Copies of this chain bind each other. A is one copy, B any other.
Amino acid sequence: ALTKSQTDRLEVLLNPKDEKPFRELESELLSRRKKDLQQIYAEERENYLGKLEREITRFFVDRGFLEIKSPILIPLEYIERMGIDLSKQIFRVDKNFCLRPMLAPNLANYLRKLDRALPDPIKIFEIGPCYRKELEEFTMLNFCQMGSGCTRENLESIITDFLNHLGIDFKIVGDSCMVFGDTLDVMHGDLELSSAVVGPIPLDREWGIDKPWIGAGFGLERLLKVKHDFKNIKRAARSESYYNGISTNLHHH
């Protein structure tokens, strides 16, 4: 009979592929996880979240999408202009700023600005940290297209080519967003990988957008969770407690 604390400790040390006294169970698992880190150190040394970003960056750059790197610390006023009055989830910084809860506002600004320079259609994407209070720190991909070719079919076609590239099975279900309105949810079982939008929407006017557009947002930690069969998404996050899904706390309980 294991205590709750003993069971939690073993669960942290347990890996999806893994298949008696507590101390002996812990020692066995600690041995396996140390060896796992040893092999990563000897043979690959890349972080899953960083590696996935790099693989996704390649996919969209190859497909003709411009790689964007925009501020993570953004004006609070951007949130207001997204119609977010959900406000409790916003991490406030200084007085007039916040940690971005989504990539959409910065990308809206880039779409409007790049429309003065780039031919039709304009295709851009960004990968990076986003924040939502009470995962609080996670990594989003947003891609979007503006101009011609901005149809439901094309949006679904891009999403399909992308998840086929990652080798992730999915389905699409109609849903809504209190920000974007009607959406397409990309589902893996009951886990939402993505929300996608077929523009235009009334919100566009507040951002100087006057062309049709399509876009989709993906959580990278959720993609890792599906790909590596993590039970707990915290295994896929920026962390001091997990590295590539392996516990970094290899002390004894």
Where the two chains meet, the residues of A that have a C-beta atom closer than 8 Å to any C-beta of B are 33-34, 37-38, 40-41, 45-47, 49-50, 54, 57, 61, 64-73, 91-94, 99, 106, 109-110, 113-114, 116-119, 129, 131, 133, 136-137, 238-240, 243, 248-251
The CA-CA distance from A65 to B239 in the complex, in Å, is 18
Identify which of B33, B49, B137 contacts A73 (C-beta below 8 A). Answer: B137
Question: How many chain copies?
Answer: 2
Known: A37-B117, A70-B239, A110-B243. 19 other contacts (CB 8 A): A33-B117, A34-B117, A37-B118, A41-B66, A45-B64, A47-B68, A50-B57, A50-B69, A54-B54, A54-B57, A70-B240, A71-B239, A71-B240, A73-B131, A106-B240, A113-B240, A113-B248, A113-B250, A117-B250
Quick check: A110 and B67 within 8 Å, CB to CB?
Answer: no
What are 14 A-B residue pairs whose CB atoms fall within 8 Å in the complex? A34-B116, A37-B114, A41-B66, A45-B65, A50-B67, A68-B243, A71-B238, A71-B240, A72-B72, A93-B99, A110-B240, A110-B248, A116-B250, A116-B251
Asked whether, in the complex, the Cβ of B129 is within 8 Å of the Cβ of A72, the reply is yes
